Amino acid sequence: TATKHLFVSGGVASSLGKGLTASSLGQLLTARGLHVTMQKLDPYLNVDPGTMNPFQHGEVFVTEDGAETDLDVGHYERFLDRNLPGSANVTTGQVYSTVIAKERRGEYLGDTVQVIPHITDEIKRRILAMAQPDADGNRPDVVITEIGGTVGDIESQPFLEAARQVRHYLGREDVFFLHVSLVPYLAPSGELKTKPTQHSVAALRSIGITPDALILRCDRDVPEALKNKIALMCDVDIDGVISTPDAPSIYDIPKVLHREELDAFVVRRLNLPFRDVDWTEWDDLLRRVHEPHETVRIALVGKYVELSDAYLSVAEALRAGGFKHRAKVEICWVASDGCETTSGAAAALGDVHGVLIPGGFGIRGIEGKIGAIAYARARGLPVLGLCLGLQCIVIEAARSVGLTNANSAEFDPDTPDPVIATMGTMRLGSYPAVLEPDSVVAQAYQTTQVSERHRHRYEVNNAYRDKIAESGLRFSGTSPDGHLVEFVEYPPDRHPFVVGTQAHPELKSRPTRPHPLFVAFVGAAIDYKAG
């Protein structure tokens, strides 16, 4: 059968949960036995979200191919269990750069390069690019493309036009349009208004797009009488009007959309092959979420506290590790700067059962993260260091030996002992790593050969390897040639669990398929909870 295209558009208010709404539909379609790939059209002029502040706009997701993408790609990968390419994230900057480059080359044969067709054509080409067969020659069944930004925006105007152009290229039978809108509840009158959805569909119909289904994001349950009024008001089928109330968990949303029969409506409208939903895997996850046997507290020693979206994949990997042990993970958002002193670190990491050191990119406060490891080693708390975390474990290890001036060249260039230095060369995407047999990392992974996603340029100095080894720390994980240090660990006879990784395992972690390092880390924190 021909490849289908589903477009998810957002109106009225922003950050409604449009990413999760689309991912949950992707989960249902994959559970129905279909090849589903997902794309996100960000309307900002930035080429890569790498230049953007992660503590203001969210974490930078890294794919297997080594592309810096939006955090929405992470939601897609977790809900599908499938690895996505770099082409899954399209920006206004990426499109406008490609079109201007071609114009300067003379690839438009003496024509006035305008948004329509030149820009809309490039967007259209990037959308239809997902329909091409992937690795092992597999063509997808349905492509869910999320058109970012509010319907009616200047930055969203060319992306919606390309989505409309695709609808006329393939036909009504191959293209579906889903629109997410907010239904607000007024406290003094005690009634929900249909006016925001009415003008949102009108703004979408003015640009030339007729929506097939409507997602009504609300705090309460939308009544059948009100749903019937919206159905006539927007000329949307009554079976297509979906009431999506605020779910207790993000993993409850696929069950909410299934109850409203949206997944069955999508298959029937696009004439896709029908097959019942296999809840066997998702029900096992829901049982681990709603029925936990234990509660474990794990501290996240990050630069900026409270904000979950700065370390979204890290927090999701921690919860995933907890589900394997059938326990609830309470993330303690600890500010790194407070752990600079041994007294301050003790007051912040006192009541916790585990300590995690995430990878800080372009940060300046490193001394706090080093101090957090120093306390955790003395108290006997399990430590999991990611990217900068491994670098901080190495600095603390060298400092405990006797090297008082041991630091990273990235933070202190005039250091007389640079234990962390370039060569430099930037590492992005999946990199292979050989593991030492019978080690803590080998016991977790249960294999001597692994592959993890990287995003850094600073490595462990090979000259200081002997001086660092004096602390007891062992370089269990190295590159195939053994030149680059990938994993560091303390033996169980010295510390139960102090493992550091140069890569980001949180990206490869899924709620249905948790990462073995996070499983071993959460498990070690449960062992700490006893006594």
Added chain:
Amino acid sequence: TATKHLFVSGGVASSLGKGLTASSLGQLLTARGLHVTMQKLDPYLNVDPGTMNPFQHGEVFVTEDGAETDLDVGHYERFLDRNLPGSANVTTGQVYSTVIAKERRGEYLGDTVQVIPHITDEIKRRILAMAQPDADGNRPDVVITEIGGTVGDIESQPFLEAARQVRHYLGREDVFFLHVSLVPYLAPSGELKTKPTQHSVAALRSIGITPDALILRCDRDVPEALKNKIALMCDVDIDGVISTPDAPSIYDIPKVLHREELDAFVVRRLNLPFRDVDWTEWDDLLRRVHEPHETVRIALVGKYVELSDAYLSVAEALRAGGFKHRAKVEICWVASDGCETTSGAAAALGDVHGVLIPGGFGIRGIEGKIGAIAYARARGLPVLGLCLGLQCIVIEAARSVGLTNANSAEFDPDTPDPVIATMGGTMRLGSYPAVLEPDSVVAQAYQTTQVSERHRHRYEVNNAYRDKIAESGLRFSGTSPDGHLVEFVEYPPDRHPFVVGTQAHPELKSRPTRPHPLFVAFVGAAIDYKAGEL
């Protein structure tokens, strides 16, 4: 006094004469004794219009600094007599190319780059850049910025928004808004429609711009009773509503706007220094336009026929040369392809008095232009070759000598005799100096031994073939200061009265009030040819 900004916005229909309406206002303000600089905002994504087809979108104007700009810059330069910089032509492509480069450099420091403010900021920076003092430290009095495209388009939306921010940042006393609209005449009812003007002003008011004056482009005279109705309908001052009927000539438009007192209204509203218009120079031009003593036919041997906008500066330079002799120039648009054969060239260039070979950039049909020179040399017609024209004179000169396979490397790369070749080579753009041979035809025209002209080419004359080309009688009268590059070629008067070729484009430096000496000498030579048939 503080630098003023005037914004010209076009609505409803396109190509009505937005460029000419703005240039005529620029002419009046300069005639009132004010430093006027003009800017054109193009909404296309092309960084330089040099990549565009000239026979589809118009000629590509070259400034003194060496920038490829829109043909509207040419209208500004001719109506002001002032040389404009590369900053006078700002495109969507330029703005987006700068902001994306800035973003990648991290100059926006962890921020989501959006149209508002990042894009509008670059446009606002580009407009305010014209207000900066020019060469010898001279700051302009008023800056006329023309916003290309219809008011209401998504492509021209950030350019209008920047003008609104310029109005906000500087003030109402320093920023003026002019809107050009069409008033159509209905044949069955016999009345003018106010609806296209009302809907256009409403579209300008919806984006947040209140127009100060309205230009009503019409075929007939707009009545004072109708002008009063539109004034109230658009909330524009009655003294600001200007009726602009279709003028017989493009040089009549400044006189039309002066009669409606638009120039005086602009000065009064912006609180600019008032001084009466010095018509001394413009009236002399109008007399040469409307009262010609002679009529001379000059053929324009170009690849495409009839389309004037492809060779706009060339046609305007030809008319300018005619005004100096107080004569009307009838341009004969001749297709180059037809002049390939000697019989076809004779049938096309038979009744003409002068032959002109313009500069064809990115063209393929060169053999026709060579054949046109071959006939003109035999018939005894004056020849003026521009850029490719000089190259074609050189090829024809070498071919008459005996080199049957002599051609340009640009058109035939496998030629055994490349008389025209690069140096890969280097692209020459802008004003380049040239030393002239004393007592030569070009020196007699220019009346100086040292000249400067604007270039836009990559291929030069092969210095190895200089001796073989010289056998025809052709002399390299114009060369670079070092003498390595050939700039001008000419035949002696004892061989041919006027066969002059130039490597550069003199048509760009030609003005209606200040004509180019080469075009004056060429038109004059064509008048001499007419005298020879009596």
